[PDB]
Specification:
With 1044 residues, the protein is mainly alpha-helical. 67% of the residues lie in helices and 6% in strands. Among the domains are: 345 residues, Na+/H+ antiporter like fold, CATH 1.20.1530.20; 122 residues; 111 residues, Jelly Rolls (Sandwich); 103 residues, Sandwich (Jelly Rolls), CATH 2.60.120. One of its GO terms (molecular function) is cAMP binding. It is found in: Cell projection, Cilium, Flagellum membrane.
């Protein structure tokens, strides 16, 4: 019967009791876990049964203790990190953690040698410094995440803690191998090779197994437990193989593996992602509880038998000197840390000095020192000093860091956050009052006690020179709360401009959050957009600019250069070799000759009759490479004569002929050069396009982030320009804000068009991914609203949700560069050319491809409409009278001009080399007259231009109801044009009509009270409409029926 199960269950129960009882106290639960472990240890020192239990558990081997507890803690520290904010400040975190750990371990070693009465040498003192310098702050990270601002400081602290733990265990292992278990001597070259092996092949092995784990997780669908077990087994196998088999630092491998797995969380399903987060947090909690209980037991059983008053004095002096040393390290690295993009202030420096909480890592290292030392007192001193430092740092640093965050002014709630929380609390209270008044007039819920219900449903406000600032901010508000007419003053004009800028920035932040909440923006795109908005909100008169937003879609770097260099590197015997199976066959021959190459290498290293005379000359060089691949498939002319890859293939075959004449002579260095050169050239020829695919994936990720940021800014500017009239009262400030917003919109649109033109195929791939993701999200919304209406039960809706989740996961594993379609495929995929194939054939026969270079004008402002222009290449600029817009590939120019037979509105000029499909107006009229079915060309063209001309009216009228542009377009897509010729050219507005827009022509309404001539949405006061049939008008209206 295992007593370890009893001890683990008792430690879990004690940790649960410690977490439950100490919710309100500022003392952490780990300190009272240590106290309970000490009580259990002295009980075990008295009672023999508890002695048996704690003897078979707490007297554990060091190696199994490390191999069990270190991977869980290290992987959870790496996996709980916010990896985007960590990698944005990776250089500062890395230099601070590495150099501060090195110099703090050196200073702690010097302090221990000069202070402690034990005659420790430099290596044991460096082991002591490596144990002491490892910090594990979790309460500081939780407090920094909870207390509003300084969100980047918590990420700095957590990343520095992760790298500090990893490199501290690395240097601890180095000095433990110097002191305790071996005593072997070596030369300087072997020491350099060992340091290089550890500090390089730790992260390299972690990166390799992390890429293998990401590739395995990317191809698992509808299987959560396989993903969870693959993550846990990958972590444990990485640490075990690295630490034992490869003799490398396994801790850095788990650090790199956790950082990469947290980086690539898109390969994991979201339910599996949140389960992995909760599961690894639970595992780290259990590991911390077990470590602290075992440490308390062994401290009060063995480490407390050798301690004097001088030991407690040295513990107090060690705590003070550790705090002073960490503060001096941060103070000496403050200018170097200040010259990064995120420079530390003095308050953040004091917080990071006082945030040095030693945790379970140093306790585990002291435990393995105590078990490794044996009967010597050095491990007892190590364990006692580490336990005292952990207790003192936890209690004093946690309580005084709560007090210090209160004192230093880093815990105050900001005024917009306070206002938003107060408004949310007021809205929740009003909703609860309306719900209570609804429930008080109910049938069943009328005898219920309402005092208890009002006491229970009482969610309140969490937040309960500053007064002068709040009074001034409330003073710059000439709103509806005070009705005094006046005239603008210049200082009042500056205050109104500042207030309008603040309202514009706040509404842009609201629009970005609305885009994120509807599954349109990405997480990192939303974070970057709100970061730019909150940066612009802190300056004097700076709006959210274009120059600081261009850095998101800066595709330039080493990756386009690598893409260009690799695509320049690679660009009836011909009929036989074109079958794309001969290359696969010879690559199979290469990969099956790779293993006897390794066999020949290891056999020549060792020297079975020499593995049967070296596999009889390696199967006579694989029958001289399958008779030189059947003499290069009997030879092929200039195709073999011009390729340099075929030239070193010829070099490989004549080197094989040199091997043949060597066998005729029957050298080892010649054979080694033969096999190495053959395998490296023939592997490089095959591994070039995989590097092309990797480079395409990296450019695809950067382009996806940049396109998401640009599209989010464009949609946010459109929403904030459609809600700008309510918030801004003065005309001049409104016009200035609209002017700067439209210039920013034009610049971002032109930049995104040129970004699409730079890399065509990758832009096509990311647009395809965004379109498929939007279609699947709307399908998921349809499934959810079908399930919520009761028309579909839970199991069938869950089957459909599993189907669309499998489709989304396979969309995540998309090709990174879809090749661009031909212009015939773009002419096929027009919105009004989607259905009818005969109309596709007629338009394709009647089209004409035209080439326009830079600077040429496609169409004028004043000339009559001569036809359409479907853009299949390049970017154009539409300048009209001031209407400015940039159109890209896929847009059609002149649809309403060729429908209404009107002169054009804008001049179309080229920004790049532009290819367009010019369908003539006569050809469009012939195609309109020929195709007159129930979906007709007139109906489809007028539906497309009706959607295009009716979305800004609906977005303007329903801006205050919280409708986005996507919801407005999806609501408008359910509509239909009314054939007015059937119903005597008069239409009646019924109650089923949700929104009715008149698209073209003039119309008369109600009892001929007035005339609605302009294209605009018809108001609710109109009951009936009458239409006239006149010359060159053709009145058309677009109605949308309600949901039936």
């Amino acid at each position: 019967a295992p007593k370890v199960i009893v001890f683990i269950s008792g430690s879990c129960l004690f940790g649960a009791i410690s977490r439950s009882l100490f919710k309100k106290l500022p003392i952490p639960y780990t300190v009272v876990l240590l106290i309970l472990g000490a009580i259990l240890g002295v009980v075990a020192s008295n009672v023999p049964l508890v002695e048996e239990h704690t003897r078979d558990v707490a007297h554990m081997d060091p190696h199994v203790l490390l191999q069990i507890f270190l991977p869980v803690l290290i992987f959870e520290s790496a996996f709980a990190m916010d990896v985007h904010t960590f990698m944005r400040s990776f250089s500062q975190v890395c230099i601070l953690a590495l150099f501060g750990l090195v110099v703090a371990s050196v200073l702690t070693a010097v302090l221990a040698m000069n202070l402690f009465n034990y005659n420790w040498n430099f290596s044991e003192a460096m082991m002591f410094g490596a144990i002491m310098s490892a910090t594990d702050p979790v309460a500081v990270v939780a407090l920094l995440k909870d207390l509003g601002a300084s969100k980047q400081l918590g990420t700095i602290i957590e990343g520095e803690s992760l790298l500090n733990d990893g490199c501290a265990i690395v240097i601890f292992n180095v000095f433990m191998k110097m002191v305790f278990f071996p005593q072997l001597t070596s030369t300087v070259g072997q020491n350099v090779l060992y340091f290089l092996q550890v500090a390089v092949a730790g992260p390299l092995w972690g990166y390799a197994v992390a890429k293998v784990t990401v590739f395995f997780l990317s191809h698992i669908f509808n299987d959560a437990l396989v993903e969870i077990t693959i993550t846990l087994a990958a972590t444990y196998l990485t640490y075990y193989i690295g630490d034992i088999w490869l003799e490398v630092s396994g801790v850095l491998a788990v650090v790199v593996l956790g950082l990469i797995v947290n980086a690539e969380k898109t390969s994991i399903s979201p339910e599996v992602e949140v389960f992995l987060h909760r599961f690894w947090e639970m595992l780290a909690y259990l590991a911390n509880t077990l470590i602290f209980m075992m440490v308390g037991v062994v401290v009060t059983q063995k480490a407390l038998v050798a301690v004097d008053k001088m030991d407690w004095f040295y513990l107090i002096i060690l705590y003070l000197a550790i705090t002073i040393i960490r503060g001096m390290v941060i103070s000496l690295f403050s200018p170097i840390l200040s010259r990064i993009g995120y420079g530390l202030t003095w308050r953040n420096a004091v917080i990071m000095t006082w945030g040095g909480l030693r945790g379970a890592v140093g306790l585990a290292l002291a435990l393995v020192v105590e078990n490794l030392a044996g009967n010597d007192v050095i491990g007892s001193k190590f364990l006692f000093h580490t336990a005292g430092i952990v207790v003192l740092t936890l209690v004093i640093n946690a309580t005084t860091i709560q007090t210090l965050l209160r004192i230093l002014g880093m815990s105050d709630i900001s005024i917009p956050k306070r206002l938003a929380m107060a408004g949310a609390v007021r809205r929740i209270h009003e909703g609860q009052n309306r719900t209570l008044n609804m429930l008080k007039s109910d049938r069943f819920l009328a005898d219920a006690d309402w005092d208890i219900a009002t006491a229970a449903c009482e969610i309140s406000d969490p937040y309960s020179a500053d007064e002068l600032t709040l009074g001034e901010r409330k003073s710059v508000c000439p709103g509806c709360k005070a009705m005094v007419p006046n005239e603008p003053s210049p200082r009042e004009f500056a205050d109104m401009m500042e207030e309008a800028r603040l309202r514009m920035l706040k509404a842009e932040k609201i629009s970005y959050w609305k885009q994120f909440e509807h599954g349109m923006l990405a997480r990192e795109a939303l974070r970057l957009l709100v970061q730019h908005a909150e940066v612009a909100a802190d300056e004097k008169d700076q709006f959210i600019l274009v120059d600081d937003l261009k850095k998101s879609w800066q595709i330039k770097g080493i990756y386009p250069w690598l893409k260009r260099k690799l695509e320049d590197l690679i660009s009836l015997m011909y009929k036989i070799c074109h079958h794309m199976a001969f290359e696969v066959t010879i690559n199979i021959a290469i990969v099956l000759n790779i293993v006897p190459i390794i066999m020949e290498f290891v056999v020549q290293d060792k020297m079975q009759k020499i593995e049967d005379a070296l596999r009889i000359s390696n199967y006579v060089f694989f029958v001289i490479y399958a008779i030189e691949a059947i003499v290069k498939i009997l030879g092929l002319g200039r195709h073999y004569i011009v390729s340099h890859w075929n030239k070193f293939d010829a070099f490989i075959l004549v080197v094989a002929l040199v091997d043949i004449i060597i066998a005729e002579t029957l050298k080892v260095v010649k054979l080694f050069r033969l096999l190495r050169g053959l395998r490296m050239l023939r592997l490089t020829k095959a591994l070039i396009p995989k590097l092309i695919l990797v480079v395409n994936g990296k450019i695809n990720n950067q382009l996806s982030l940049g396109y998401d940021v640009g599209k989010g800014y464009i949609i946010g500017e459109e929403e904030v320009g459609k809600i700008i009239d309510r918030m801004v009262d003065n005309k001049k400030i409104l016009r200035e804000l609209k002017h700067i917003s439209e210039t920013g919109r034009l610049q971002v649109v032109k930049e995104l068009g040129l970004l699409q033109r730079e890399h065509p195929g990758i832009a096509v791939s990311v647009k395809t991914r965004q379109a498929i993701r939007t279609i699947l999200n709307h399908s998921r919304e349809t499934i959810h609203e079908l399930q919520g209406a009761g028309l579909l039960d839970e199991m069938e809706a869950h089957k459909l949700e599993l189907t669309v989740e499998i489709k989304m996961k396979r969309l995540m594993n998309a090709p990174s560069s879809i090749p661009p379609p031909p212009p015939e495929n773009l002419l096929k995929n027009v919105s009004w050319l989607a259905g009818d194939m005969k109309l596709i054939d007629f338009i394709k026969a009647r089209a004409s491809l035209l080439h326009f270079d830079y600077g040429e004008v496609i169409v004028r402002e004043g000339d009559e409409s001569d036809g359409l222009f479907l853009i299949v290449s390049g970017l154009v600029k539409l300048y009209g009278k001031v209407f400015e817009d940039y159109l890209t590939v896929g847009n059609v120019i002149g649809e309403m001009g060729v429908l209404t037979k009107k002169p054009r509105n804008a001049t179309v000029t080229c920004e790049t080399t532009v290819q367009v499909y010019f369908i003539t107006a006569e050809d469009m009229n012939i195609a309109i007259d020929t195709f007159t079915l129930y979906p007709s060309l007139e109906y489809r063209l007028w539906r497309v231009v009706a959607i295009r001309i009716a979305t800004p009216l609906i977005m303007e009228q329903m801006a205050f109801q919280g409708w986005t542009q996507e919801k407005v377009k999806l609501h408008l897509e359910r509509g239909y044009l009314v054939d007015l010729a059937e119903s005597h050219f008069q239409f009646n507005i019924d109650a089923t009509l949700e929104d009715v827009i008149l698209i073209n022509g003039t119309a008369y309404n109600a009892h001929t009270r007035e005339e609605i001539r302009s294209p605009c949405l018809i108001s609710r006061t109109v009951h009936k409409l009458t239409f006239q049939y006149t010359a060159t008008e053709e009145p058309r209206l677009f109605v949308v029926r309600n949901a039936e």
